[PDB]
Amino acid sequence: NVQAHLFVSLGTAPAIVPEAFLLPGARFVSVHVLTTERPDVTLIREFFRRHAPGVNLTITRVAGFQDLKSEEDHFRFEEVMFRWFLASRTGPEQRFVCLTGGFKTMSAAMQKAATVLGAAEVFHVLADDCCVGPQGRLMPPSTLEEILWARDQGHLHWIRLGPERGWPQLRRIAPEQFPLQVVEEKGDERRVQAEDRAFGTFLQDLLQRASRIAGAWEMLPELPFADLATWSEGELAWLREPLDPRAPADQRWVAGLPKIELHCHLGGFATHGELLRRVRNAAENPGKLPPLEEPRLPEGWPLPAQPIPLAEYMKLGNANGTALLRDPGCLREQCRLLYRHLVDQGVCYAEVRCSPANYAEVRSPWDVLADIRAAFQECMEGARTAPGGLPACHVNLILIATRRASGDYRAAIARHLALAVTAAEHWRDENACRVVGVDLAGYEDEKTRAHYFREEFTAVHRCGLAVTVHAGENDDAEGIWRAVFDLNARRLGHALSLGQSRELLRSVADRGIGVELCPYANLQIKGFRLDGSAPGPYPLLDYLREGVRVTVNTDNIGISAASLTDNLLLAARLCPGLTRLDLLHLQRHALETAFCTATQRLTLLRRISSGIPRP
Amino acid sequence: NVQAHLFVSLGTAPAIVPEAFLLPGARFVSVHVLTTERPDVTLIREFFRRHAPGVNLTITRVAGFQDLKSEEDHFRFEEVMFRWFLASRTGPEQRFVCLTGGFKTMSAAMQKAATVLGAAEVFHVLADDCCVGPQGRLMPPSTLEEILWARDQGHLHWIRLGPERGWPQLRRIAPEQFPLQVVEEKGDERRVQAEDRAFGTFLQDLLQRASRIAGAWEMLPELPFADLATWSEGELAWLREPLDPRAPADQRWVAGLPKIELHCHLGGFATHGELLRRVRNAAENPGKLPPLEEPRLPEGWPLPAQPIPLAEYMKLGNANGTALLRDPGCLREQCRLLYRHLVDQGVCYAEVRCSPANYAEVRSPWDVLADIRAAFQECMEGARTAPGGLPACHVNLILIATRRASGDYRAAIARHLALAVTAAEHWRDENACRVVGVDLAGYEDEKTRAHYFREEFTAVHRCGLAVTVHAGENDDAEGIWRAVFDLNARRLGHALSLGQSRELLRSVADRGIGVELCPYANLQIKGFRLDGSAPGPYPLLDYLREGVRVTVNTDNIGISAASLTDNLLLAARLCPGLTRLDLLHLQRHALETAFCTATQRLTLLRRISSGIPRP
Numbered sequence A, B: 001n002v003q004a005h006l007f008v009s010l011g012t013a014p015a016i017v018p019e020a021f022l023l024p025g026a027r028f029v030s031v032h033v034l035t036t037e038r039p040d041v042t043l044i045r046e047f048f049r050r051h052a053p054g055v056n057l058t059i060t061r062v063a064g065f066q067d068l069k070s071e072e073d074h075f076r077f078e079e080v081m082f083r084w085f086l087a088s089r090t091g092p093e094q095r096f097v098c099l100t101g102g103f104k105t106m107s108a109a110m111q112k113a114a115t116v117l118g119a120a121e122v123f124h125v126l127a128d129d130c131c132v133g134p135q136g137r138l139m140p141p142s143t144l145e146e147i148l149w150a151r152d153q154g155h156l157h158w159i160r161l162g163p164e165r166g167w168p169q170l171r172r173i174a175p176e177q178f179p180l181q182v183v184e185e186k187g188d189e190r191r192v193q194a195e196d197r198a199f200g201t202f203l204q205d206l207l208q209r210a211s212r213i214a215g216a217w218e219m220l221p222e223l224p225f226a227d228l229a230t231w232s233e234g235e236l237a238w239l240r241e242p243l244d245p246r247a248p249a250d251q252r253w254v255a256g257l258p259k260i261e262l263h264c265h266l267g268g269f270a271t272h273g274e275l276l277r278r279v280r281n282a283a284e285n286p287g288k289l290p291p292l293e294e295p296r297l298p299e300g301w302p303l304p305a306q307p308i309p310l311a312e313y314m315k316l317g318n319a320n321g322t323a324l325l326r327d328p329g330c331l332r333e334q335c336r337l338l339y340r341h342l343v344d345q346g347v348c349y350a351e352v353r354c355s356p357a358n359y360a361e362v363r364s365p366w367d368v369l370a371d372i373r374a375a376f377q378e379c380m381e382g383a384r385t386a387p388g389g390l391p392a393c394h395v396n397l398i399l400i401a402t403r404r405a406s407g408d409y410r411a412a413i414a415r416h417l418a419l420a421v422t423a424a425e426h427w428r429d430e431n432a433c434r435v436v437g438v439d440l441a442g443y444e445d446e447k448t449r450a451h452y453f454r455e456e457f458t459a460v461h462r463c464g465l466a467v468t469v470h471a472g473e474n475d476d477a478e479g480i481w482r483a484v485f486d487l488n489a490r491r492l493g494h495a496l497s498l499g500q501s502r503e504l505l506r507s508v509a510d511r512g513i514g515v516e517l518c519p520y521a522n523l524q525i526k527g528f529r530l531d532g533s534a535p536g537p538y539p540l541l542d543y544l545r546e547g548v549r550v551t552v553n554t555d556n557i558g559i560s561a562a563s564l565t566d567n568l569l570l571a572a573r574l575c576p577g578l579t580r581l582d583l584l585h586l587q588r589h590a591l592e593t594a595f596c597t598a599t600q601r602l603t604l605l606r607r608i609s610s611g612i613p614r615p
Ligand SMILES: Nc1ncnc2c1ncn2[C@@H]1O[C@H](CO)[C@@H](OP(=O)(O)OC[C@@H]2O[C@H](n3cnc4c(N)ncnc43)[C@H]3OP(=O)(O)O[C@H]32)[C@H]1O
Pocket: A010, A011, A012, A013, A036, A038, A039, A066, A067, A100, A101, A102, A103, A104, A105, B013, B015, B016, B019, B100, B101, B125, B126, B127, B139, B140
């Protein structure tokens, strides 16, 4: 019922196409013949003129192939063959391929094309000596009547190799992508050319990718991302080696990674240098600006020789914050520079903490929050890069409830929680900046543990808002236990003492509660050995091996004076033996513990999977 | 430095093997020849005796392959070819394939085996007609001096076309898996056979699997299991159609699915029929056996016309339980029969609930729990089928704390919690029966909500043990909220009223808390419309669409008189439009919400993925 085209190759022995056209069962239409320059085709044309008028025979010749000496012209013939198969518009269900005729390599190319593109039947024809000729027991060369006689009395074989399936993306495709060129053209006869070997590279790379995927099909659920299955064996072996922070190639690779940020404070971004000057030279009221004064950093501040405690760590960012963000222009400018920095670092999703009520003097905290939200929305709408018309970096908001050692600090917590609930219920567009949770931070000790604020957070739990708690930075595991089991926290920050209790660590691992680590902040405050030279070993590797969803963050960019890339590199330095697959696992954990919707999570997963740079 | 083996076919034209042997810049060792028993090889051995005495060539002839008549001859030649390639412990980098000689199909199969097995070089040799012969302009015939003369004068071309890579898991295989027979054994010349076409089927399956995987590479993250990527397009389309409970094929497919059980009561298994008699005829002391009396079931009990309340449902299983299980023989037989039923149903992992203290009259509850654990452990050890030497079904234990409307029940709750903690601390082997959590079931109302039992479960939370709660079966969403946020429940049972509160549903979906539903029990107690003909619609589809991890279980197998297959089919009946992929998603959710270790979870994931039957 199908059209049943017949593709055949021709050598220097004519009367092959007449034999192949005669098939016990096939009603062939539109016979196609592929041949070189020298063979003659008069006999075939006479056959199809006298015995089958309606078969509209077409003959194609390769432009510059007449005798093969090297491999260069074989590649030309193969490329022209592939484009010639592609030139017509036929599915595999109506393709019959005959490999008889031509050089020994031409038949191999015939079968390779048939098994790659797909065909209904691959076969070849044989005939034995039956004609007396001038020399006894001679093959029937010509003089069609003896070919028909041999068919009728019946010794022709027609060995049927069988059907072929073909790769699915190559079954149809299009010929406009890979066209041919006609050099000279007479009736039903052509000479053709191809500019390049694009189809060869396309086919080769798709087969190579398929071979790699078949090679890496096991150990797939252990892989953080699916695209890693398309990597070569050498690349995968290199991925399992320990990361070397000194090597510039490793630094470039880490800088080229898509990243997710979950712990970043807005008030500690621009505290020194040119960034502070740029923020200051944007105020609407320059008259009321406080006099410029930069706190002096300790010796070798990025990597101090001695640890320092919290008080001067907070005082080190006195040049920015409440003293400076009280001006609306400064707040806007701060937001723009933070978004620019996040985009430059390669982050694709970030959550930013803020304390709007600290910046309200004549305006309400609602106005401050609206200003921050509008500035971030305008920044996201400005940079419509990335595929699908989505912002380069998506920013969500988290509000901070601060607790202090003494004074008046507990009314502000209530104001922040109420504002967070109202704002979360106000803005609800999925593809926009939103308030997605609250955070309990500040001074921590025995008297300010988590279970003393349950009555304040009951309303937050009633309204359905996510909660993160700072715990374990300067306390034992009891604070972490109370945060987990009394405030129903979903994420923990600076849980450095989680390893003191095995049962608590098992509970955190089993419940999927995320942990956030900041290598620079932890090293600068608690002190830690570097390069394997009494706080103890850094607990990153222990958490990774135990099964905890641990992530690496930046905390205060300005105060600690570094970014995500530097934090990852020092994470490698603090735990010798850390691998690159561990970095990918960290990114996967950050994706899984984010405070986002399911569709956004899937989109981020796809975006990160295809963005990992190769060695 | 490689050995550089050479493989070449030969037809009715000698002096081709010596020409291919003289490949420039290649020192060959142990050249191999494949023939069709028709031609002669005297020339080959004569040449290798005089000009290369250290190459120890071999010659092979194919199993009565006289001439090409039909396709069976070609198939036998191809099978002998593949087994001949395998029966030489050779790597990809030292194979050199020459597709010169024999039929066109012979050279084509040469190239096919080269590109599948991954040769290191494929080439084709040509010669120039430079010999006088008896008629001028002749190819160089048998004699060797003229072959050497033509090599010296530069009349050989050696068209060589690229190396090959080959599929990775097929690069080695092993000779002792598709062996060759030896019909006749003469010096350096052999005739070989092959029992069957096993390698052909192996290769066809491999290529088809690779092609299907390449066809379905996208939409892989959405697939619950990876093996679904190896299904054909028709099967995948059939997977998305709505389930038809009336179709016998669908019934067989559901019965053939690997399953996970998470809500099963031990005391409600054998309550009627032959199973109850079998349990009764196992007592150590039949004198104290209470008289037999089976409660009568309502009309059309499996699908009753009107719902019944909990009291009659519980009284329906009075023939078994506390009255019967105080005798250890009956308890042991009960456990054996339940494990047999679970294996028959196809369950690969199950968690069983029990109340040992209810069966302690002269023995301690510790002895009863030890007997139950020993019975299940012995049952697991006995049936060590399945790959890896693992038990067919793995059973873990959960202990019930029962609350009642009036009477003395809190002491029993404290007893059960303490026993659970001690038992969980006692048995710690990963590949063994273990106690993994506690349950809060029984009578529920306003006065017996979850937050009235916090002080009793604080110890369980300190020791790090999983908790599940019966909530929502006969209460509004307030009970579910209290269970989630005051008792830190990890999984909920019969949460039929979760949809009344949107915030609670969103929180449950975000936190990953599991929900268990029992179709038959829910229909029998609450009443629900069937086939889409006021309790409202059954909430399976809403929970699935909202992202809640929802699973389907059996509750009481005996009282409700149904199994997992019946429950899944009735779930399809309760929500028209339920698809088969939805059943797979339910299985994945059950796997994700279980109380097991990570290694066991990975093993179960692989086992379920590699065991889904095809349509
Ligand atoms: N000392 C040797 N003695 C004998 N054979 C040798 C020797 N050394 C190498 N070989 C090769 O081994 C195959 C012997 O079967 C031959 O390979 P192949 O050249 O590919 O033969 C195929 C035939 O060449 C013929 N055709 C010659 N021109 C052309 C041409 N320009 N377009 C297409 N076909 C050509 C074809 O016409 P067709 O279909 O009747 O048969 C083929 C020989 O070239």
